[PDB]
């Protein structure tokens, strides 16, 4: 097949420029310039995916040096000639003096960037540096105090004759060299500090008591300064630190609105479509009919979503009373029919294969409902551990005595102790949709409740409102309501598959326009499995 190998490669390449560049690579190999290693490395990205073509090429060509990476280039031997006196023979033979790295070569004369941090993280680093400078000065001062205290203790059992002559070298008889230099230079002036430390160096026991007293009162004032700064520092960090730990959840209030739209989900499922089609075209002609599958292991989650929905029903004011009644009834009936739930078993107190062919609005509606189900699913799957951890929150007794615990949310009852976490966040979402929660407190409680893992529930009211607005189009739009009515006609809970869904398919396809999107949402009764398979423009072509 050596004749058609090049035409097969040309068909696989697609782009003209890439084919020409592969031609150039092959010619560079053909002119005794490129060796076997570089050719095979180039082919690894070129024809790595095609295992059959790669094996044929390797068998036909006949396959059975240093790496020299981009950094650490070789220095000349002239720079090697340097003394480095503390060197012995083995230490020569292990270390290399002709290889050096320097970051501008890595940056290619463009520099480097830092990771972008939120304003809460920036002010956390800020409060960290204010806390650094204070106690650093304080404890350098305690070290100087203990040094001069040892000096004064040596003075206290000593007489005047050698008090007059107590010449000492720099260091004050300690292993340190310049820490007292820093301390008495920081406390006093720049020019005065050098002269007073000179007097301390050559004449101790005359300036040492007074500088000890001055440094002791400096210590005491720095200590109470730290003490009354400590309270405001802690009260600021209590609300700053948890928000700083939230990175995706800080922008979740806008990212959720941006990405839970019609066109984003359309692109999301069409990408999975085109990947499946061209991957199988590479591999095998028949195509699968399952993609972007969701699992439904818990049944009470739909009841929680119903509680959120009819909590939002009685809160909004932009809709009429019979409009609200019909929308709530339809929202309940959708699970009362589609998931084969005979009736909602929570509808009393303590409550505040089959194929579906539908348009774009029902697809977006079901996608938001699956997203809210998944949010509650990762809420509930860690509930048994988070509730346990909250239940045994061992408060430090020392912090109990002098009052450093974060009681910001405990005054208003936003704390989670003594109550199941899932029911508590359900109630919190009820009051959150009700509009009397002061949102920042709600995300703060979620931050200090689930250890920042509950970042997907920040816009639970927003996704609930979007869900309600999308379900409002299920009745006002004539095509969507007609599709729903012929799903009332179609759904019969009887063995009628493989001969009744085809006429359903052509009937909806004749029912909708050319520009409307078409979706096959397959629901399975056992194990509560669902499947949405994309059939966009796959029926009107022929």
């Amino acid at each position: 097949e050596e004749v058609t190998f090049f035409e097969k490669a040309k068909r696989y390449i697609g782009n003209k420029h890439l084919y020409t560049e592969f031609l150039k690579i092959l010619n560079l190999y053909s002119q005794d310039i490129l060796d076997l290693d570089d050719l095979v490395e180039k082919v690894d990205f070129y024809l790595g995916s095609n295992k059959e073509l790669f094996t044929w090429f390797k068998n036909f060509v006949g396959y059975q040096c240093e790496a020299f990476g981009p950094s650490y280039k070789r220095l000349p031997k002239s720079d090697t000639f340097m003394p480095c006196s503390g060197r012995d023979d083995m230490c020569w033979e292990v270390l290399n003096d002709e290889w050096v790295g320097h970051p501008v070569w890595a940056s290619e004369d463009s520099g480097f960037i830092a990771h972008r941090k939120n304003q809460y993280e920036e002010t956390l680093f800020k409060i960290e540096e204010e806390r650094h400078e204070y106690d650093f000065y304080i404890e350098s001062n305690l070290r100087t105090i203990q040094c001069l205290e040892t000096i004064v203790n040596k003075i206290e059992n000593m007489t005047e004759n050698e008090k007059a002559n107590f010449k000492l070298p720099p260091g004050l008889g300690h292993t340190s060299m310049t820490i007292y230099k820093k301390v008495i230079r920081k406390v006093y002036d720049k020019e005065r500090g050098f002269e007073i430390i000179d007097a301390l160096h050559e004449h101790p026991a005359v300036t040492a008591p007074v500088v000890l007293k001055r440094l002791k009162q400096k210590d005491e004032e720095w200590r109470r300064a730290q003490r009354e700064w400590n309270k405001v520092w802690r009260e600021l960090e209590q609300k700053v630190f948890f928000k700083s730990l939230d990175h995706l959840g800080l922008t979740f209030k806008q990212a959720d609105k941006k990405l839970l739209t019609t066109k984003q989900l359309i692109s999301e499922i069409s990408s999975i479509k085109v990947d499946q089609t061209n991957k199988k075209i590479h591999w095998l002609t028949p195509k699968p009919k399952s993609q972007l599958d969701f699992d439904f292991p818990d049944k009470n989650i739909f009841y929680d979503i119903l509680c959120l929905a009819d909590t939002f029903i009685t809160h909004t004011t932009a809709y009429s009373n019979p409009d609200k009644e019909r929308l709530k009834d339809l929202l309940k009936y959708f699970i009362s029919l589609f998931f084969s739930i005979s009736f909602e078993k929570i509808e009393e107190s303590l409550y505040s294969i089959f194929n579906l062919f539908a348009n774009t609005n029902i697809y977006i509606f079901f996608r938001h409902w699956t997203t809210i189900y998944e949010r509650l699913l990762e809420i509930k799957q860690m509930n048994e551990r988070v509730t346990k951890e909250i239940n045994t929150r061992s408060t430090v007794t020392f912090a109990k005595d002098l009052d450093l615990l974060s009681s910001q949310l405990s005054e208003m009852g936003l704390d989670f102790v003594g109550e199941d976490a899932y029911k508590q966040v359900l109630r919190l979402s009820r009051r959150l949709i009700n509009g009397d929660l002061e949102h920042q407190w709600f995300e703060e409680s979620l931050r200090q409740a689930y250890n920042n893992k509950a970042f997907k529930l920040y816009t639970i009211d927003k996704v609930t409102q979007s869900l309600v607005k999308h379900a409002h189009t299920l009745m006002t739009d004539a095509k969507t309501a007609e599709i729903m009515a012929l799903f009332v006609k179609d759904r019969n809970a009887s063995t009628t598959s493989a001969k009744d869904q085809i006429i359903y398919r052509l009937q909806v396809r004749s029912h909708m326009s050319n520009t409307e999107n078409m979706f096959r949402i397959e629901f399975d009764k056992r194990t509560l499995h669902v499947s949405i398979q994309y059939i966009a423009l796959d029926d009107l072509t022929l």
Binding site: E2, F6, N15, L18, T20, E21, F22, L23, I25, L26, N27, L28, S30, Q31, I33, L34, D38, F45, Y46, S49, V61, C65, E108, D109, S110, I113, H115, R116, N118, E129, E130, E133, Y134, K186, Y188, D189, R192, I196, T207, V210, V211, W222, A225, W229, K231, V232, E235, L248, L250, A255, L259, Q264, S267, E268, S271, I272, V274, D275, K279, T370
Partner: protein, 317 residues
């Protein structure tokens, strides 16, 4: 409830600063009584030295006679044309025929003696490529400080995309869902990765299944970050060359030959073409595909022919 009014203390105020405590409360009684800022010789920045009556400033190393800051000369300092403008050959001994006296004195070097003259009456400077050397290579250009920059280097990013690029975006797409990188604005289709035929956009409910993709800076070929071994994107520095193009320099070991390409010649008479032979040309590469620094019109048929010819020669070995 932060209170920076009363709890901010008096001895130590807002940090990274000082206060009057180190000056007023510091009594010790224990002792018992024209110039420029651009360095117009290399167009760079650094430590500068300037002349009193000359606005030009130089570097410490950009001086014909090199000098160091540790042993800088004392008193007034003067440049070369400063020594020939306010000093000798322009104030006393006026320039009447001393230029011809250079020829008459230095043994008839007249074909170079006037250049020997204006060497000393010229400020020292770093090397600068002439403009006629620049124009024959259109792919190269002069940078901000005067460094080499061909098409291999990427244009530096503006500060809007660099500092004030919001929090969700960050320097790289390594954070949050960014589906805009998987869709090109030229046609609105999906960027299919070359190695694996998948866009891998993923889902918003499952962001972790999303695989990062990047466009190429030359052929706009999409490429996943996991297929080719690479950690993150390429935003500053050289342009991201995908591992499918011809390398500028290759290495074959027989000491060795580099073959640092043949650059690029602008479209004029120097760029000369000749297709006459397809078989056994030995043209050491540097080709272009069609349907001195000569470039022969090479086609697909000849390339695949001589490739087959060479691998039929080499398999007997």
């Amino acid at each position: 409830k932060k209170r920076p009014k009363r709890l901010s203390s008096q001895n130590v105020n807002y940090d990274l600063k000082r206060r009057k405590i180190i000056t007023s409360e510091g009594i010790e009684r224990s002792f018992k009584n024209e110039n420029e800022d651009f360095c117009s010789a290399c167009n760079q920045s650094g430590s500068f030295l300037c002349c009193d009556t000359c606005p030009k400033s130089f570097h410490f190393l950009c001086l014909d006679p090199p000098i160091d800051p540790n042993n800088l000369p004392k008193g007034d300092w003067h440049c070369n044309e400063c020594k020939f403008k306010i000093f000798i050959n322009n104030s006393m001994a006026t320039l009447k025929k001393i230029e011809s006296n250079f020829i008459k004195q230095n043994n008839n070097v007249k074909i170079f003696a006037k250049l020997l003259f204006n060497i000393d009456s010229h400020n020292p400077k770093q090397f600068q490529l002439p403009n006629y050397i620049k124009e024959t290579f259109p792919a190269v250009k002069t940078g901000s400080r005067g460094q080499y920059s061909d098409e291999n280097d990427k244009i530096p990013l503006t500060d809007r995309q660099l500092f004030n690029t919001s929090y969700g975006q960050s320097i790289t797409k390594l954070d949050s869902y960014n589906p805009d990188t998987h869709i090109d604005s030229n046609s609105g289709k999906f960027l299919i990765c070359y190695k694996c035929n998948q866009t891998r956009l993923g889902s918003w409910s499952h962001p972790e299944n999303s695989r990062l993709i990047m466009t190429c800076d030359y052929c706009q070929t999409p490429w996943h970050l996991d297929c080719v071994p690479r950690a993150s994107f390429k935003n500053l520095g050289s342009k991201w060359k995908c591992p499918l193009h011809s390398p500028t320099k290759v290495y074959k070991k027989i000491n060795y030959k580099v073959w640092k390409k043949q650059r690029l010649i602008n479209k004029k008479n120097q760029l000369y073409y000749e297709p006459l032979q397809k078989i056994g040309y030995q043209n050491n590469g540097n080709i272009q595909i069609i349907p001195d620094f000569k470039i022969t019109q090479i086609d697909e048929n000849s390339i695949k022919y001589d490739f087959f010819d060479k691998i039929y020669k080499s398999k007997m070995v």
